[PDB]
Every structure is written in structure tokens, then in C-alpha cells.
Amino acid sequence: EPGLPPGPLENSSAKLVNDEAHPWKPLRPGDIRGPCPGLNTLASHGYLPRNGVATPAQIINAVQEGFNFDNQAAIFATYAAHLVDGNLITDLLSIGRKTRLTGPDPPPPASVGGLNEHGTFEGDASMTRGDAFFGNNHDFNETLFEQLVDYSNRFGGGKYNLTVAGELRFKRIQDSIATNPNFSFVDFRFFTAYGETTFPANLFVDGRRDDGQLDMDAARSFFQFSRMPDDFFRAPSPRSGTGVEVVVQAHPMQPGRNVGKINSYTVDPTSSDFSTPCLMYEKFVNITVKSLYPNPTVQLRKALNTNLDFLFQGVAAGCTQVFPYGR
Ligand code: HEM
Ligand SMILES: *[C@@H]1O[C@H](CO)[C@@H](O)[C@H](O)[C@H]1NC(C)=O
Ligand SMILES: *[C@@H]1O[C@H](CO)[C@@H](O)[C@H](O)[C@H]1NC(C)=O
Ligand SMILES: *[C@@H]1O[C@H](CO)[C@@H](O)[C@H](O)[C@H]1NC(C)=O
Ligand SMILES: *[C@@H]1O[C@H](CO)[C@@H](O)[C@H](O)[C@H]1NC(C)=O
Ligand SMILES: *[C@@H]1O[C@H](CO)[C@@H](O)[C@H](O)[C@H]1NC(C)=O
Ligand SMILES: COc1cccc(OC)c1O
Ligand SMILES: [Cl-]
Ligand SMILES: [Mg+2]
């Protein structure tokens, strides 16, 4: 019932992806878009179902076909998101808000809240979306985008590149520390917050150039309108987070959180960090997934174990698989 994770592209060359079969269309009533401009764009070009509800296999195929996201990264992200935000029985995940379209819900404490669910996959210090504490963690924010433009002007000669990513990533962390008393920057979010800042440079840059310099017209088109530029070619090879080391090196940070007040950022020594990637995977499964499904019934336990096996396919070589519900 859960389909097998798709394999890598047979042909990963750059090609036109804004093509006749995948035109941009505006939203219809009920169409769901969320905090990810990549998935949003794929839905708005029909690489995913246009209503924003999809299976993990549909998501993996879409990120590969439309943007040349690499297979390992696609698998890890998709199954992580599905485990914490999707319906494991129906095999459906919303790319934004919680919806009845993902089917009959499992029992509490599982939320099946879609990608909009705060603190599962989605988290604080996003580039163009506000922190959940401020009321909306999913819609495009013009003020935040204008700051991205400003940082691109200051550090990228008017373009978004890895140097800009390094500076903006830090600025957003510092702004959340100063204003969000509930700011959390540990474990899974600590990792994804860095990786996501490379994606516009690696994946939104036309693949015929692949120069890591994203122009602001293209940036707005993706971030605000979920729309590929006219004649957009995808990247010329599979990739996801390459160059994340540049972003980290610009302003190395420890994982931590504000402790109920602004300007109280307190390092968490129980968090994983970039020195312990396997711990990030182990805590995600043992703590995050397990807490949503502490004592699942038979069909849920089976679906959990299958999706956990799929998640492990995307885990970097050298980590040991963990089994929260037995073998
Ligand atoms: C493979 C499955 C994917 C999933 C499940 C996924 C999910 C998400 C989620 C939940 C966020 C919000 C994190 C946060 O800021 O709090 C996010 C951010 C982001 N995603 Fe993805 N994503 C995926 C692939 C991609 C791809 C292929 C691209 C580009 C082609 C992309 C581009 C981005 C960008 C740029 C952000 C940051 C948005 C911002 O901070 O303003 N994603 N994604
Ligand atoms: C792979 O796709 C590219 C772009 O569409 C094309 O030029 C190339 O010849 C394809 N390779 C094969 C083996 O068909
Ligand atoms: C506040 O932080 C906790 C995690 O420490 C999280 O469970 C909760 O959803 C957060 N809420 C908002 C609006 O940030
Ligand atoms: C956008 O972000 C700014 C800056 O953090 C915030 O003040 C504003 O309330 C957000 N929302 C909108 C709708 O502009
Ligand atoms: C970003 O652009 C600026 C200005 O062109 C340049 O100095 C810097 O080296 C660029 N960084 C990257 C990683 O391309
Ligand atoms: C996760 O649970 C497994 C037992 O299934 C255990 O071996 C492992 O040490 C745990 N890891 C963490 C980080 O809790
Ligand atoms: C490969 O890593 C990732 C995959 C999907 C989303 C991410 O950031 C939100 C991310 O950092
Ligand atoms: Cl790949
Ligand atoms: Mg966020």
C-alpha cells in the first residue's frame, strides 16, 4: 500500500521543466500551499496534484523530475515529513494546512497537520515565512522577502548566493532570538534551517547557468507565486544542500532555544548538531515520531515500520537503523 521510494532519475540532464505538460496555474478554491516554495511550485505546475495533497512517491518523483533534487535527500525529507505530518494509512500528505483530504485521522497525540504543523518539520527562522509565534508560519511574507533582497544587494551583488545565505541565515536567527520568546533551534530544525538556505542557489538557478547566483525576479516568482520563470531549465545534475558548509562557516551556531523570554538563548547539550548527524536521525525516530505514535494499533504499527524503513534509505551511510516498534 505505501509505494516503494522512487529511484534516481534515469536521465538527470538539464532540460526545460516549465513545459507544455506542466503549465503554471493559479490556485482554485481548496488548493493547498504551504511553507516550502519547492513543493508549492511543483503543485502549481502540476508536477504534484494541484490541490497540494500527495503521496510520498509523488513528492519524490516531482522534486527529482522538476528540480533535480537528489534521491537520498528526496527520500529522507519526504519520509520524515510524512511520518510526522502525513497520514500513514492513506499514504497522503498535505504540503500546507491540515485537511480532511488526507483521510480519517489516527488517534491523538498524532496531529497529521500537514507541512504547516509547527515543530514537527516546519520551524523558526525561515527566510520568507514568519515564525509560528507571530501568527503565520506558511504564507509568503513581503517584509521578509524584501530583507532577502536587501541581503542579496549587500552580499551577492544583487543576487542570492551562498554568501548571502550565510548572512541571512544568521540575521533570521538573531531576529528570532530578539523577538520570539518561544524560539526553538534544535535537532531536526537546526539541520534543515541551514540546508534550506542553499536550495535557492542550487535549485532555483536555471540549469543552463548553474552558477549559484539567483536573480530576484526568479526568486520572487518561486517564493511568492510558486511559479517557474518562463523557459526555466532545471539543474544539470542531482543535488540538494551542497555548499551548506559555507552557510555554517559564516556564523557557526550551537543548537538551543529561548527559554520563555526574548534574548534568553540557551544552548541544549542534548541536541544533535553537525558533529552528530546519526543522533539527529535517532532522536527524530525515537522521540519525535514515537511521541506522535506511542502505542499504535496493528495497521498503524505496520505503516510506521514501512515508512521508517524508507526513511532509513535516505539516512547517510554509517548510521545504524533504530527500531522503535521492534523488528
Ligand atoms: C523533498 C521534499 C521536500 C519537503 C518535504 C520539503 C518541506 C519543506 C518544509 C516543511 C519547509 C519549511 C521549513 C521551515 O522553513 O521552517 C521547507 C523549506 C524550504 N524548502 Fe522545502 N521541501 C522539500 C524539497 C524542496 C525542494 C526540492 C526545494 C527546491 C527546489 C525546496 C525549497 C525550500 C526552500 C527554499 C525552503 C525555505 C523557505 C523559506 O525559508 O522561506 N524544498 N521545505
Ligand atoms: C537526456 O535528456 C537530455 C535532455 O532532454 C537529452 O539531450 C539527452 O540526449 C538524453 N539522454 C538520453 C540517453 O536519451
Ligand atoms: C513553542 O515551542 C514549543 C517547543 O518548545 C512548541 O511545542 C510550540 O508549538 C511552540 N509554539 C509556537 C507558536 O511557537
Ligand atoms: C511579515 O513579517 C514582518 C516582519 O517580521 C511582520 O512584522 C509582519 O507582521 C509579517 N506579516 C505580514 C502579513 O506582513
Ligand atoms: C556572492 O556574490 C558576491 C558578489 O558577486 C561575491 O563576492 C561572492 O563571492 C558570491 N558568493 C558565492 C558563494 O558565489
Ligand atoms: C533509540 O532507541 C534505540 C532502541 O530502539 C536505542 O538503541 C538508541 O540508543 C536510541 N537512541 C537515542 C538517541 O535515544
Ligand atoms: C536535504 O535537507 C532538506 C530537505 C528538505 C527541506 C529542508 O529544509 C526545510 C532541508 O534542509
Ligand atoms: Cl539522485
Ligand atoms: Mg518556518
Curated annotation (Swiss-Prot):
Functional pH dependence: Optimum pH is 4.7 with ABTS as substrate. Optimum pH is 7.2 with benzyl alcohol as substrate, and there is another optimum at pH 6.2. Optimum pH is 7.2 with dimethoxyphenol as substrate. Optimum pH is 6.0 with naphthalene as substrate. Optimum pH is 7.0 with pyridine as substrate. Optimum pH is 7.0 with veratryl alcohol as substrate, and there is another optimum at pH 5.5.
Listed GO MF terms: heme binding; metal ion binding; peroxidase activity
Residue positions with a glycan: N11, N141, N161, N182, N286
UniProt cofactor(s): heme b
GO biological process: hydrogen peroxide catabolic process
Gene3D superfamilies tied to this protein: Chloroperoxidase-like
Record has Transport as a keyword: no
Keyword Disulfide bond: yes
UniProt cofactor note: Binds 1 heme b (iron(II)-protoporphyrin IX) group.
Binding site for heme: C36
Keyword annotations: Disulfide bond, Glycoprotein, Heme, Hydrogen peroxide, Iron, Metal-binding, Oxidoreductase, Peroxidase, Signal
Disulfide bonds: C278-C319
SUPFAM superfamilies linked to this entry: Cloroperoxidase
Reaction(s) the record says it catalyses: RH + H2O2 = ROH + H2O
Coiled coil (residue ranges): none
EC number(s) stated in the UniProt entry for this protein: 1.11.2.1
Family from the record: Belongs to the chloroperoxidase family.
Function: Aromatic peroxidase that oxidizes aryl alcohols into the corresponding aldehydes and then into the corresponding benzoic acids. Oxidizes toluene and naphthalene. Catalyzes the regioselective peroxide-dependent hydroxylation of propranolol and diclofenac to 5-hydroxypropranolol and 4'-hydroxydiclofenac. Catalyzes the regioselective peroxide-dependent hydroxylation of naphthalene to 1-naphthol or 2-naphthol via a naphthalene 1,2-oxide intermediate. Catalyzes the regioselective peroxide-dependent oxidation of pyridine to pyridine N-oxide. Halogenates monochlorodimedone and phenol.
Protein name: Aromatic peroxygenase
Source organism: Cyclocybe aegerita
